[PDB]
Design a protein around this nucleic acid. Sequence first.
DNA 1: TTTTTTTTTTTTTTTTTTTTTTTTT
DNA 2: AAAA
Lengths: 407, 646
Amino acid sequence: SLSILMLHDPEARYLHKILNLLPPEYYVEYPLWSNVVFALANTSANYRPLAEWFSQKCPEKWNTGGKEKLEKLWNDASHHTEKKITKRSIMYWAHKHAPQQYKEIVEQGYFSILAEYVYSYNGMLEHYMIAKVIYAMMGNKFVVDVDSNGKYVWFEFVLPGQPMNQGEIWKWRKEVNPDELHIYISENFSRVMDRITEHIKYHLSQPHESNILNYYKKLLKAFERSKSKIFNDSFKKGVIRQAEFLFRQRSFIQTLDTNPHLLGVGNGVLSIETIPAKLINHFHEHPIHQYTHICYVPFNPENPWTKLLLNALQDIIPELDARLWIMFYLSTAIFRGLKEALMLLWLGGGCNGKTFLMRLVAMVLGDHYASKLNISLLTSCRETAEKPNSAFMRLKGRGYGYFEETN
Amino acid sequence: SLSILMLHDPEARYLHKILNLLPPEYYVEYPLWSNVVFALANTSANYRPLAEWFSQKCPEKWNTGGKEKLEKLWNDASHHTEKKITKRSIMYWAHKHAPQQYKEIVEQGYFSILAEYVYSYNGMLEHYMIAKVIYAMMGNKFVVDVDSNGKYVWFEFVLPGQPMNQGEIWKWRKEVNPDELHIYISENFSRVMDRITEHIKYHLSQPHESNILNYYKKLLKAFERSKSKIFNDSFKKGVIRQAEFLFRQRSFIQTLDTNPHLLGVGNGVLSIETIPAKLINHFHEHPIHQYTHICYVPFNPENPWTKLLLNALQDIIPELDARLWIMFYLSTAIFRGLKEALMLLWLGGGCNGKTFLMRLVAMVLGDHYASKLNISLLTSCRETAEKPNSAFMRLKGRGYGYFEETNKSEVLNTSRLKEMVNPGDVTARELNQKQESFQMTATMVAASNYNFIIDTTDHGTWRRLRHYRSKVKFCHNPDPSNPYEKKEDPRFIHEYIMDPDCQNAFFSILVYFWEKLQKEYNGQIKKVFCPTIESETEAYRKSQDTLHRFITERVVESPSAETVYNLSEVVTAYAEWYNTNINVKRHIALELSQELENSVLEKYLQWSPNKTRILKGCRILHKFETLQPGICEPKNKWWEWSPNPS
DNA sequence: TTTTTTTTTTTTTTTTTTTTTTTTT
DNA sequence: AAAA
Ligand SMILES: Nc1ncnc2c1ncn2[C@@H]1O[C@H](COP(=O)(O)OP(=O)(O)O)[C@@H](O)[C@H]1O
Ligand SMILES: Nc1ncnc2c1ncn2[C@@H]1O[C@H](COP(=O)(O)OP(=O)(O)O)[C@@H](O)[C@H]1O
Ligand SMILES: [Mg+2]
Ligand SMILES: [Mg+2]
């Protein structure tokens, strides 16, 4: 089926090209090879021969190992709900381990796409073809989804070295209008246009029969006329309007920030899924949007501020067991999943110190995850007046809530 | 009348060609040709000649099977409808078994249409022609209708193997903008363009006189100029706007989800029209849009989760008859049509599982079919004047409404209660919009640990209520002395609900119970006797009646004395009594005066000549004032319903 | 029982048009 | 080079 694999599907040939220049030691290693097999399986269920061939390269694993076990693993990956990793991630490892050679590969790929369109339609460019060529590149950024209000929304993935606000690195951000997309389509696409022009000029230079007398002249004239369209504002608006259909991704907005084991931190995200916690400061695929402006560092008791805070905590409440219990309960606010349903309330004097800690926790967790409520919520008459309340929007996605003092 | 078929458009011959692919054994199968003739009946009435020809389509046993058989199903009543399979499905039947020829037939059909247009108009394509070609090449995937305020909304039929949300398979979904339509018209229409270009070039290749020297060249130039227009944005928007009219289907939005016998599940649509319940995971035509994310599987008691749920349910309620009645009542939540006017309320104390149970039903049945209702609706103290009340909504199409524990025992006046149980229509208005009327068909349950204060005596009110009292409590120290005590489980509520398998098992149990009830006495709830139920209800009705308690406490057993003026002092004594004996509340004296006649004081209630209805005589008690002168337990399985007595 | 729902807006142009250089004369 |  290998000939069938490179017979019908264009991105099947593209994936076949990408599968080279790979570190086959990772294929030998069970964990990473299983991860990439799962990622490939999540990319459609018609890639069974492709996955078999990927298991066929370096045949030592397919000859010395669980061949039936691997087939069953691929099958259950096909018919189960779990991670849906995609080659995107793979593209990231390919760039990380094998630079240089991939650049010319992808460049020649989208150059071939554009040249095929130009030859097919006599150099008469139009919104859809440039939109498709643009979608051939990027993919890293500019994911489009429909909001609850029915308006298309653009989400841009932030990378280091860009003009961004504090804490927006390594996570998506909401964009009212894709400014970077306009800048890119106006600037970098000119390079591909110049490449096409040089290609057609070179073919014009070589001598042939009367075809070069008129056909290439007409093609060059048409392409020169169509080149200036990419700088027109209305043309760019139409291209963006057509491209938002391709970038549209189903089930993205409602699947945003749903994972309770990932927290948007000022240096990226935190992986509290497994012990110990990991900080992710590189490319990933987790749909994280909300964040806090507090950088994360490993817990070092030798730090002077950590020592001061620990001494203050010891001074606030003397009981060791009570201190440990209350600290354990307060640390639960970092989680965002279902928790044990218990309420803590503690009283004291005007200098009890209760307010200060609650305030420090709220400030550390940030506004997105922490919220302050009103004591009147517990002590109020029933809403027989039908007037809607103003506080139940709180706790939606929040991991912590506190009540203030009252005379 | 074959010449009539010849003259009546090429679409008749197109249908001829597509139906020629039906095998003779398909025509032999009685239901197959029955539903096919019904489908052609739904599409106009001029297809009688086509049906007559179909009588001779593979007629190897038409004479054996009866000449006047196929025409009988149509000639008996050409009019009248049964909501059956129309067209839009014969193509699916042809494609499900006869590929290759079907696809080439449809390909040559729309190719002929487009070639006719391009030849007629000298290769100058426009919006309407492309829209018609697109509609012809897929009329089985999109529907357009107009909603209330007035817009054009696009619905598309989801099929396996394409990006989608979870659980929206085999059913329509609402699209603000037909994205896949744009993708198709930009991608797959280029194939037809290439085919037409190749045909034109092939015709140009063959030599002839001047009629092809420039005529083909001119039209070829025009067509290659117009080819690039399909990739335009404004042109595509215009084509979509034009095609909005072709895909128009009258009476589609208001018929959405109107059938109460169809349920949208995670893996398709569930039909409960016939016994047993049928799951559809293929092409169909039922207009459903709402759904739930609970996959449906047949009721298998061997499943470990089903066993665990059954054991827990048996432990929660000990009585077999009461358990069966409760499950039968809860099984009606699946139905969404008109139901019998029954209100269920059952009390308890501490750990009872009532609320926990309500939660399982709510999550299993889904958000679009189940709702949470505030107790303020049934408080009945508030009289909603001309003002919005959104709490009265969330009953449209819902088949289940449940309540929760309250602060303390509360009064429930018959107002805002009589219309909440009856199978009638109610009206209310909310933010924006205006007043509207809607049929309510949701089964209602309300449980509490504090008794509901019911103040009424009419048989009409005390006929749509059922009261139960749970007898099993949960405590962390289950002393092995009384059976009505068991250990708890925090994960019994913290988890066992998030796991989808539990929802699947509970849905299977609910479907099985509904099927069992339907196989019983044609539905309904009044029959199937449960001696515990309605007996607890009449015992409750004996209590919760202050007037009878007042009479039996003060005047009954002291009839010999005579201290009576009129209804006035009786009213005052009852008022101070109920004010002290019970809570304080305001009343109108006419209701008490009328009910006093209906009370058990008729033996002393005689109207005096000057009216005043003076009681013949009793003793109003003050101070202490004493000395006044006057089942089978099932063996191993209980879900099997036991025999008829059960 | 005000209060916020209702009221106030909301997109308002964009599309286009023009031409379109080249092609025909 | 002027008009479609
Ligand atoms: N660990 C500490 N050591 C010394 N002073 C403290 C400490 N914690 C709080 N304080 C001071 O004591 C005061 C009481 O804090 P606060 O939380 O307002 O008391 P309460 O919670 O009773 O209102 C604060 O003004 C703060 O500056
Ligand atoms: N079959 C069972 N197995 C284990 N624990 C149960 C069972 N039934 C009830 N429980 C305990 O009782 C609770 C059930 O809900 P409960 O709180 O009793 O509802 P209600 O609000 O009616 O009291 C659970 O938290 C659980 O700990
Ligand atoms: Mg304080
Ligand atoms: Mg409960």
